[PDB]
Amino acid sequence: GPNICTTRGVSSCQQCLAVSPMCAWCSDEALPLGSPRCDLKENLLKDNCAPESIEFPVSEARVLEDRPLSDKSSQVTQVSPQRIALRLRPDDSKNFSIQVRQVEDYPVDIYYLMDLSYSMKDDLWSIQNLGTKLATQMRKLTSNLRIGFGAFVDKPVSPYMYISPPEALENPCYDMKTTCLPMFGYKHVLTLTDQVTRFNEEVKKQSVSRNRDAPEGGFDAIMQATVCDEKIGWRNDASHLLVFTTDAKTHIALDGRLAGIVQPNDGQCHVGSDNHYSASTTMDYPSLGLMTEKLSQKNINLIFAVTENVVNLYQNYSELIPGTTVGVLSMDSSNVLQLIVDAYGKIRSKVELEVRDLPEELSLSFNATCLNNEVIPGLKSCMGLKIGDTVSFSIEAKVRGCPQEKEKSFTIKPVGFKDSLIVQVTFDCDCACQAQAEPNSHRCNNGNGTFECGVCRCGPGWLGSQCECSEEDYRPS
Amino acid sequence: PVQLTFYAGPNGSQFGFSLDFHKDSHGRVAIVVGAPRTLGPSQEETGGVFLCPWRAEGGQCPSLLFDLRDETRNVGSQTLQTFKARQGLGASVVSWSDVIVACAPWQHWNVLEKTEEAEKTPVGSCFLAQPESGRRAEYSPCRGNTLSRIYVENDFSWDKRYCEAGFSSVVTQAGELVLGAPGGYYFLGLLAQAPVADIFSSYRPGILLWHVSSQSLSFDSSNPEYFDGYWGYSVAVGEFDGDLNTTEYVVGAPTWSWTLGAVEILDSYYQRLHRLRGEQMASYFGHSVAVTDVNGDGRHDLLVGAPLYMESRADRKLAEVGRVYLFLQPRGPHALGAPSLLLTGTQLYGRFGSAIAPLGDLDRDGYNDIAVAAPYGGPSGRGQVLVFLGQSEGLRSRPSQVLDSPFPTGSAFGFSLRGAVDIDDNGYPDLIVGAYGANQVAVYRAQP
Ligand SMILES: *[C@@H]1O[C@H](CO)[C@@H](O[C@@H]2O[C@H](CO)[C@@H](O[C@@H]3O[C@H](CO)[C@@H](O[C@@H]4O[C@H](CO)[C@@H](O)[C@H](O)[C@@H]4O)[C@H](O)[C@@H]3O)[C@H](O)[C@H]2NC(C)=O)[C@H](O)[C@H]1NC(C)=O
Ligand SMILES: *[C@@H]1O[C@H](CO)[C@@H](O[C@@H]2O[C@H](CO)[C@@H](O[C@@H]3O[C@H](CO[C@@H]4O[C@H](CO)[C@@H](O)[C@H](O)[C@@H]4O)[C@@H](O)[C@H](O)[C@@H]3O)[C@H](O)[C@H]2NC(C)=O)[C@H](O)[C@H]1NC(C)=O
Ligand SMILES: *[C@@H]1O[C@H](CO)[C@@H](O[C@@H]2O[C@H](CO)[C@@H](O[C@@H]3O[C@H](CO)[C@@H](O)[C@H](O)[C@@H]3O)[C@H](O)[C@H]2NC(C)=O)[C@H](O)[C@H]1NC(C)=O
Ligand SMILES: *[C@@H]1O[C@H](CO)[C@@H](O[C@@H]2O[C@H](CO)[C@@H](O[C@@H]3O[C@H](CO)[C@@H](O)[C@H](O)[C@@H]3O)[C@H](O)[C@H]2NC(C)=O)[C@H](O)[C@H]1NC(C)=O
Ligand SMILES: CCCCS(=O)(=O)N[C@@H](Cc1ccc(OCCCCC2CCNCC2)cc1)C(=O)O
Ligand SMILES: *[C@@H]1O[C@H](CO)[C@@H](O[C@@H]2O[C@H](CO)[C@@H](O)[C@H](O)[C@H]2NC(C)=O)[C@H](O)[C@H]1NC(C)=O
Ligand SMILES: [Ca+2]
Ligand SMILES: [Ca+2]
Ligand SMILES: [Ca+2]
Ligand SMILES: [Ca+2]
Ligand SMILES: [Ca+2]
Ligand SMILES: [Ca+2]
Ligand SMILES: [Mg+2]
């Protein structure tokens, strides 16, 4: 039938093909009475004229770099294929599937709070191990990890500390005739870092202090750890873990009334250039609500490692505080390592992608097929991605017209992944046969016109097939 | 709301830590306010007591004269030194007849005898002021000649070195003052009851240490469950066993039995009559226990605040709001059981239940009404006070009225408040809130 190629065209190969992609050109000479050279490929085949000169360009996607994705040693292939080469026609659409698989391990930042009370001394050694041992567990579980720790005793205010004799201020252990360092509220020791040896050395360097009341200000230390960002150097794009160690009761909110401190501990950091809680004497123990809010907002999981003697207290605390876990702090920390592994096993990442260096003229559409094997249109990322899962996205790109540049290069970058997909697109507006050119030919009415793939275009108006109709003549009625 | 007077004080002195009402024999009613960090003539923060008269404009008040000078007494080859520096005078102020009792739990007291010393621990000393007679006496059951070594050798039994005397103060109808100090017995806590007249008569100048024959201290308990429980954090006086003659003492401990907290009702002889335990743990059950017949049938009822209580409404999200527990005394000689009622707050992290100040009856009809503190409540998170209109059945969950905190952030408005006393003699109690953060006290008259 007439279709669309035959109509609204039949002037040149470029315009003839520009009507629609599904058009073909018959370069070889044939009968012009049937309006050939612009019609469906099937119609041209029925009309012959296929001496290897058929001009029916199509869009073909060529893969340049398609290294296999990592399955498990210096490749780390997260996106495959890596580099794509594509050829497009004006007013055309084509689809391509891109697969992405997780390779890199999940980063982790761990904070360790230690008590340095006199009572803790007997168990102090043990808690130190619980630090370093825990680090070892994360050393064999992941490659990217940061670890930091801080120490706490109690607020530096009476009656929590001895004031008589005056030497008690610099050495409260006067009754026992022993030397102990002054008791302090909170003292951040090591910021988050990958230097495990320095972490162990600083943990071992810590000593013990003395206080009066059995409860200790662990809530202040927890709030300081979970409230300071620059001092602790938390990473936004990484999981966070907190491990607090103790042996005896822990101070709770409103206890400072005994020492004369009533102002709460707000969600602000009060440790700068001194590694000390300057406002400890004027800030009260934060309640469980503030700590829970900080943990939820910062996405921090808290593990209370305590001795079996008062383990029930911290079991009750965990029951009251969602998201935290309880473990036994003793010669063996298996009950803590198992809980840490279980918590780390629930970490879930997200796979999102963005496109850059693309002119707004081109249009794009996509569908998502995650591990659920369900095709969803309009969603560029599912929820609940785990290491080893492969996600395939079918992106369909449509281009209208032929850009003057004729060559473009754009990038598809997954969110949080350095690797990216580089796609180079080319366009072929002109026809191959036009390479012949033949500016002058005797068939254009004795060399008075231009010839192009079987059609003579001549003069400023000469439109006849033989290039003889002229511009003022050829006016039949 | 307009008639909300403000009483100020010295700049940067935490004016409003504790407040109470005083009614001297002259017939003039005043507000006693204790600023722990009052700046004295020596440019040192020790503590001050302000007897503000009822003034519409409020403002600064004439600080009542008190012995802020250290007394280096010598007796019995021993030196008694009163370390009044940073003593926090005014943490608990009460009145009875023409006597004003102002206690300083942080007033460190020391005894020097050769190398050994008693240490300047916060024993707690209470000044008795009688302006009409111009008398300034001192009372301190915690103070004693016993040395630290004696306490250490006897397993710390009857440890009266860090009592923090005067943490809670009550005046009985008979005329005997009862002081509860949770710091006694090595933070276990203790109670000491003594007539005011006996101590006043036995007081002599320049002594600072003298045994009182009429003193009655609590009996020490060796049960580990009481260790670090703070038995004495809140003290109330009432009747629960039906004996009108005898006065029963209710002691609310927030850290009793591994932070669970509880309230113990005991007879006048410091013998346990009944015990009550909270439902949820870590809620600070026992910060302030009040005794009042909410139902109104002649039997006192117990009110306990738990500011740290955590509740949940949707998604099983445990959020800290606070709670109030009501225990009703059963008719006849019957022991109390589970909490009669439980009331929950609205604001998040408001510490609803930190302090409970009885208001007696608001509408003066027969139904008792109470007030509770939310020191850091409100949409902004500055402070709130919730008024509960009691009912014969019990206490309504939804408060009748809520008062916000006009002071800036950090004022901790509502932390300390007292009621059940009328200043203008209008027939209704007048509420006072000791906002220490702003160094101001807010007085508002409750108009039903
Ligand atoms: C004691 O009482 C004061 C109230 O006066 C409490 O608040 C303190 O107020 C003083 C006011 O002298 C303030 O110091 C001033 O800070 C100014 C900057 O804000 C200084 O520069 C001033 O700037 C003005 C605006 O540009 C200008 O007009 C003026 O001429 C001057 O140049 C000024 O010189 C003073 O140094 C304190 O910062 C302020 N403190 C706080 C914490 O806000 C004070 O808090 C009370 N004391 C306690 C312990 O609470
Ligand atoms: C915090 O952790 C502790 C563990 O250290 C949990 O202890 C548990 O406490 C409950 C009681 O709340 C125990 O259940 C029973 O308790 C009764 C004693 O309570 C009795 O209660 C009745 C009213 O029901 C009263 O009339 C009685 O006078 C008396 O007070 C006891 O007799 C039972 O045998 C039984 O133990 C539970 O056993 C106990 N568990 C352990 C391991 O000790 C505590 O529940 C927990 N806090 C919260 C809020 O769960
Ligand atoms: C990625 O997912 C999208 C879903 O939005 C797929 O688009 C769908 O593709 C199919 C062809 O595979 C289209 O089918 C055609 O539908 C038209 C009617 O619109 C019909 O006339 C044709 O005969 C044919 O059936 C479909 O319309 C289109 N849209 C939807 C909503 O399904 C896309 O194909 C997927 N990617 C790949 C590479 O398959
Ligand atoms: C404690 O309760 C008892 C009752 O259980 C109260 O006892 C009362 O004491 C008064 C005296 O103070 C008694 O009055 C007496 O009356 C007789 C005449 O019958 C007279 O001769 C005496 O001189 C005396 O005035 C009264 O009868 C007695 N009550 C009873 C029921 O016998 C006591 O007052 C209470 N304690 C306090 C401090 O209130
Ligand atoms: C063991 C004495 C020294 C304790 S401390 O001053 O060094 N403080 C400990 C914590 C602690 C507190 C109290 C305690 O029980 C004290 C026992 C009190 C017994 C009371 C019981 C009731 N009757 C009076 C005595 C044990 C340890 C520190 O880590 O710094
Ligand atoms: C992209 O679209 C083409 C068609 O435009 C799809 O081609 C199909 O390829 C499969 C084999 O891979 C054949 O079995 C189908 O018959 C083809 N269909 C058509 C209509 O040609 C192609 O699958 C799509 N996806 C990708 C990644 O190229
Ligand atoms: Ca220990
Ligand atoms: Ca301590
Ligand atoms: Ca009785
Ligand atoms: Ca009753
Ligand atoms: Ca009423
Ligand atoms: Ca009034
Ligand atoms: Mg300790």
Assign 3-class secondary structure to chain B: CCCEEEECCCCCCCCCCEEEEEECCCCCEEEEEEECCCECCCCCECEEEEEEECCCCCCCCCECCCCCCCCEEEECCEEEEEECCCCCECCEEEEECCEEEEEECCCEEEEECCCCECCCECCCEEEEEECCCCEEEEECCCCCCCCHHHHHHCCCCCCCCCCCCCCEEEECCCCEEEEEECCHHHHCCEEEEEEHHHHHHHCCCCCCCCCCCCCEECCCCCCHHHCCCCCCCEEEEECCCCCCCCCEEEEEECCCCCCCCEEEEECCCCCEEEEEECCCCCCCCCCCEEEECCCCCCCCEEEEEECCCEECCCCCCCEECEEEEEECCCCCCCCCCCCCEEEECCCCCCCECCCEEECCCCCCCCCCEEEEEECCCCCCCCCEEEEEEECCCCECCCCCEEEECCCCCCCCCCCCEECCCCCCCCCCCEEEECCCCCCCEEEEECCC
Among B285, B268, B284, smallest CA distance to B276 is for B285
CA B304/CA B288 separation, integer angstroms? 6
| Residue B149 CA: distances (Å) to CA of A171, B152, B153, B244 | 19, 5, 6, 43
Is A119 strand, coil or helix? coil
Under an 8 A CB cutoff, do A163 and B120 touch?
yes
Place of tokens 């500390």: A161
Q: Is A82 exposed, middle or buried (0-12, 13-18, 19+ CB in 10 A)?
A: middle
CATH topology for B5-444? Answer: Methylamine Dehydrogenase; Chain H (2.130.10)
Backbone φ and ψ for B7, nearest 5 degrees, come out as -110, 125
Under an 8 A CB cutoff, do B164 and A159 touch?
yes
* A162 in B contact zone (CB under 8 Å): yes
Q: How many CA atoms lie within 13 A of A167 on its CB side?
A: 7
Under an 8 A CB cutoff, do B349 and A289 touch?
yes
Q: Please tell me which of the candidates B230, B307, B437 has its beta carbon nearest to residue A263.
A: B437
* Domain spans of chain A, in order of start: 59-102+348-428, 103-347
Ligand 1 contacts CB of residue B12 (under 6 A): yes
Ligand 12 centroid to residue B148 C-alpha, Å: 49
Residues in A touching B117 (Cβ below 8 Å): 164-165
Tokens of A309: 């003697």
Place of tokens 């608990």: B92
Site residues for ligand 3, CB cut-off 6 Å: A 95, 367, 375, 377, 394
Give the nearest ligand 6 atom to A95 CA.
Answer: 1
Tokens of B123: 């024993």
CA B183/CA B176 separation, integer angstroms? 22
CA A192/CA A149 separation, integer angstroms? 8
After which residues does chain A show a gap where C to N exceeds 2.5 Å? 72
Structure determination technique employed: cryo-EM
Under an 8 A CB cutoff, do B310 and A320 touch?
yes
Ligand 6 contacts CB of residue A99 (under 6 A): no
Under 8 Å between Cβ of B88 and B95: no
| Residue B294 CA: distances (Å) to CA of A84, B241, B301, B328 | 81, 17, 6, 8
Q: Strands B18-23, B417-418: parallel, antiparallel or unpaired by DSSP?
A: unpaired
The secondary structure of residue A232, as a DSSP letter, is T
Ligand with minimal distance to B227 CA: 5
Among B343, B318, B261, smallest CA distance to A288 is for B318
Among B282, B181, B253, B164, smallest CA distance to A160 is for B164
Ligand 5 contacts CB of residue B163 (under 6 A): no
Is A293 strand, coil or helix? helix
Partners of residue A339 on adjacent β-strands: none
DSSP string for A48-106:
---SS--B-----EEEEE-PPPP--------EES-EEEEEE-SSEEEEEEEEEE--SPP
Backbone φ and ψ for A129, nearest 5 degrees, come out as -55, -45
Ligand 7 centroid to residue A215 C-alpha, Å: 12
Under an 8 A CB cutoff, do A289 and B254 touch?
no
CA A150/CA A160 separation, integer angstroms? 20
Q: Strands A325-328, A300-306: parallel, antiparallel or unpaired by DSSP?
A: parallel
| Residue A422 CA: distances (Å) to CA of A102, A103, A278, A411, A412 | 19, 19, 53, 5, 7
Q: Strands A83-88, A421-427: parallel, antiparallel or unpaired by DSSP?
A: parallel
CA B439/CA B165 separation, integer angstroms? 24
Under 8 Å between Cβ of A83 and A75: no
Angular region, A147: left φ>0, alpha ψ -120 to 50, beta rest? beta
The secondary structure of residue A385, as a DSSP letter, is B
Q: Is A316 exposed, middle or buried (0-12, 13-18, 19+ CB in 10 A)?
A: middle
Partners of residue A277 on adjacent β-strands: none
Return the best residue to mutate from A96, A99, A364, A367 for the ligand 3 pocket (most ligand atoms within 8 A of CB): A367
By alpha-carbon position, which residue is closest to atom 3 of ligand 5?
Answer: A212
CA B358/CA B352 separation, integer angstroms? 15
* A309 in B contact zone (CB under 8 Å): no
ω into A81 cis (within 30 of 0) = yes
Ligand 1 centroid to residue B12 C-alpha, Å: 13
Quote the crossing angle between the two packed helices A288-298 and A218-227, to the nearest 10°. 30
Tokens of A21: 């992609």
CA B186/CA B227 separation, integer angstroms? 8
Under 8 Å between Cβ of A240 and A298: yes
Angular region, B89: left φ>0, alpha ψ -120 to 50, beta rest? beta
CA B289/CA B264 separation, integer angstroms? 10
Residues in A touching B79 (Cβ below 8 Å): none
CA A265/CA A252 separation, integer angstroms? 12
Place of tokens 């009747």: B239
CA A405/CA A407 separation, integer angstroms? 5
Among B230, B247, B226, B217, smallest CA distance to B144 is for B217
Q: Strands A300-306, A239-246: parallel, antiparallel or unpaired by DSSP?
A: parallel
Tell me, in Å, the resolution of the deposited structure: 3.9
Under an 8 A CB cutoff, do A214 and B437 touch?
no
Ligand 3 centroid to residue B296 C-alpha, Å: 77
Tokens of A25: 């050109």
What residue type is assigned to position B105 of the chain?
Answer: P
What sign for the dihedral angle of Cα A443, A449, A451, A452?
Answer: negative
CA A48/CA A51 separation, integer angstroms? 9
* Domain spans of chain B, in order of start: 5-444
Q: Which of B46, B121, B161 to mutate to test the interface with A (most CBs of A within 10 A)?
A: B121
Backbone φ and ψ for A449, nearest 5 degrees, come out as 180, -175
> Which value, to the nearest 10 degrees, does the dihedral of the CA atoms of residues B126, B128, B129, B135 take?
-130
Return the best residue to mutate from A62, A94, A95, A98 for the ligand 6 pocket (most ligand atoms within 8 A of CB): A95
Residues in A touching B36 (Cβ below 8 Å): 260
CB atoms within 10 A of CB B332: 7
| Residue B57 CA: distances (Å) to CA of A340, B52, B60, B164 | 61, 11, 10, 35
CB atoms within 10 A of CB B271: 8
For chain A, counts of helices (H) and of strands (E): 10, 18
What sign for the dihedral angle of Cα B380, B383, B389, B390?
Answer: positive
DSSP string for A344-384:
HTT--B---EEEES--TTSEEEEEEE-TT--EEET-S--S-
Q: How many CA atoms lie within 13 A of A265 on its CB side?
A: 38
Q: In terms of CA atoms, which chain A residue is nearest residue B438?
A: A263
Chain centroid to Cα B212, Å, comes to 23
Is A115 strand, coil or helix? strand
To the nearest whole Å, the CA of B217 is away from the closest chain A CA by 20
* A312 in B contact zone (CB under 8 Å): yes
Residues in A touching B353 (Cβ below 8 Å): none
Among A109, A366, A139, A96, smallest CA distance to A225 is for A109
Which positions ≥6 away from A420 have C-beta within 8 Å?
A: A79, A411, A412, A413, A414
Give residues 253 to 292 of A whose Cβ lies within 8 Å of B: 253-255, 258, 260, 262-264, 266, 287-290, 292
To the nearest whole Å, the CA of B417 is away from the closest chain A CA by 15
Chain centroid to Cα B129, Å, comes to 19
| Residue B172 CA: distances (Å) to CA of B69, B175, B239, B268 | 31, 5, 11, 11
